[PDB]
Symmetry: D2
Subunit: 224 residues, 4 copies
């Protein structure tokens, strides 16, 4: 059923890459998913998993072939990545991915976007934002652990687009998604790329994925 | 070329586990092999590459299965890793990987084995060792980044078998190997697992792998 | 003249703790005060200094004596810390410090506060906040790299106080201050402690500290 | 008692540098000294202390003045550290300190020296060494957590001197020392510098420092 669900997302949206479901990724997901998990532990594995997710997403950047010469003085043919990029996090749950992103891309520029779903309706509203100036010319690693309704990421995307970011240069990095948020995301912005660790089954009346993980941001920041 | 070699090696040696040759992987490999790379950059990228490799490798241990219930108060079918392990680094080069093991496995016990081959005779002698008392009952991640002749890792496997470690409980973690190294290891110890990041074409007259990386230990620690 | 400002500040405000001015500490500040330093470098050293700075601030927590016995089976007279604490960051600049608090306090609870000065006038207004539930009972490490006029940091405290946090349980962690701000902080909230690394002589019309460091937040996040 | 102690040595040996005995340090020492603290923790806290210890030693190096210009387009008179350095670990316990060193000094060259006391004679002898080719041109941070009798470090020093390093250019970085140890190092190489974090009362009948911490290397690497 998971299977059947993984593959359908997969045969269905060529734009998503599903991180390889190794025994290890699964163990990590287990610890994180578990309610019994203390904060010290949760942060540790959450951080552990995030480095892996990023390392994977980084493969969507573009690269050229580069050839070098070894100390043995022979030629090796490889590649290099030349793109200007930056990471944008959606406050606050997205903030927990910055570190991972910064651990591998030393000094990478970081934008932050604050979105709040309206009280009356629940239309999502852009509250605050600080983005690199020339973000129009960069590839963007859009950071957000959970993808329920996709309400927020979609808003985030709306704004990035507004500023001139090309849809095709946006890499949505995520941990846990819902078939439904996946669908809305590609229905509005088919050109984006989305890299995820996991797809769960359904969404709750409170719009929490399930089986899910609970409130990620509170769990990670300890604002339980 | 490389694809063939890769295929055959993969075909005659089923306990080899070559890492996913992603574009990021290659790129790291690219910077690490370059003769011009400054020491600070070499180290930084080695560690990065190293972290991914350890993560690959941990997938070789046995894992339980575990059902957990989430904050959504429903259950999750996870997995848990229940074995007892340790890291054994082959001094000095293998030491470069310890940190990576420790980054992912906090407090993991670490054993060290200094093998050195004799000046005239050229043979590997055991010169220094300091291991965990119960290594007999553990899974060992043997760490040594280069594998050319397999001359020394073979001596390290021998002493571990004399302390009573099970052969099939040894996981040999490596960055770069030569086909000949591979053949040897598996000829003497068919029951080990080996996880590697790259397999080079062959070795030169001086028994250095090529196109290779040079002297890993020397480039990592700064003694050349 | 530095000394002169350092001491006059030091004798007037019993509650401020200045870090010992070491050649290395000054070497870090030199690098980060300089306009020519690259993002990757600025971030490195800012992270470096921050860690020393928290380590310092943490000695303002209360601790009990504890006696243990050494592996030698002789007793040693320790001094355990045991109070509940949490860090609270002032978005955005302050957030650069949480990583340091987390480096040293595994899974420490983190609270975020977003305050924006008011356009027409100039009063700092609470834009958004997310704190631990039981914060009234914790000691708080309030983080904000800079302290010009102190408006923002007098607002964050105001809200803290209203949430019930006891004033003498608040530790203000700061890299750089202007006397002026140091003055408003204590006139308003005499009972709180402030730990800082440097005090600069003056403030400019745009409210920047001089010779100071420029806009900390953007140089660290690279939105400059 | 202890105070009479730090007093005599600080008085008799002008090149010793004890770190500030702050509450946390004590606290830290308290956890690492306890016989019931588990491996994961012992390492976490040892690393934490070691990092402060190294920041401290880094101050022993020569430094230049440097005036920079801040973004406020004004001058700042900093300092800069210009010497060539490298760390040299006394294998195996000294190895635990490399990481600290490498966390603050990226890419520093690291030399290693393994010295053992003969099984019968007790004489300490050089067993293995790999060091930067130009160590004589550098300032040496010598790490060894423990200094009892000082047999080991004295021998270490001796080989660096045979290699040509300047006695005055060696900074001996230590976690715990016994008076006997200090007096010996000084009688023998009065020109070196020693930065330590604590000085214990004495040696057991068996040559262990008390109250001590026991075998560091074993508690650190997990060989206990
Ligand atoms: O933090 C969360 N956001 C959205 C979700 F659907 C969920 O489970 N958790
Ligand atoms: O460090 C190394 N040892 C052996 C080799 F063959 C090689 O290439 N590198
Ligand atoms: O980042 C900064 N903002 C405001 C200041 F006054 C200052 O010195 N730095
Ligand atoms: O590990 C140790 N080495 C040397 C000592 F003197 C001691 O007490 N502990």
């Amino acid at each position: 059923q998971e299977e059947s669900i993984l593959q359908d997302i997969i045969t269905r949206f060529p734009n998503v890459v599903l991180m390889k479901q190794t025994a290890q990724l699964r163990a990590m997901m287990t610890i994180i998913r578990d309610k019994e998990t203390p904060k010290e532990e949760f942060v540790f594995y959450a951080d552990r998993l995030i480095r892996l997710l990023i390392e994977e997403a980084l493969n969507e950047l573009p690269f050229q072939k580069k050839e070098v010469t070894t100390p043995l003085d022979v030629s090796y043919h490889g590649v290099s990545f030349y793109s200007k990029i930056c990471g944008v996090s959606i406050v606050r749950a997205g903030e927990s991915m910055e570190s991972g992103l910064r651990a591998v891309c030393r000094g990478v520029r970081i934008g932050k976007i604050l979105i709040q779903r309206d009280e009356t309706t629940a239309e999502p509203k852009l509250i605050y934002e600080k983005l690199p100036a020339d973000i129009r010319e960069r590839w963007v690693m859009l950071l957000d652990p959970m993808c329920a309704t996709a309400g927020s990421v979609c808003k985030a995307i709306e704004v990035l687009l507004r500023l001139g970011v090309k849809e095709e240069r946006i890499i949505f990095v995520n941990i846990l998604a819902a078939p439904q948020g996946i669908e809305r995301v590609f229905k509005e912005y088919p050109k984006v790329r989305m890299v995820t660790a996991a797809v769960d089954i359904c969404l709750n009346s409170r719009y929490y994925i399930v089986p899910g993980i609970g409130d990620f941001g509170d769990r990670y920041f300890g604002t339980m």
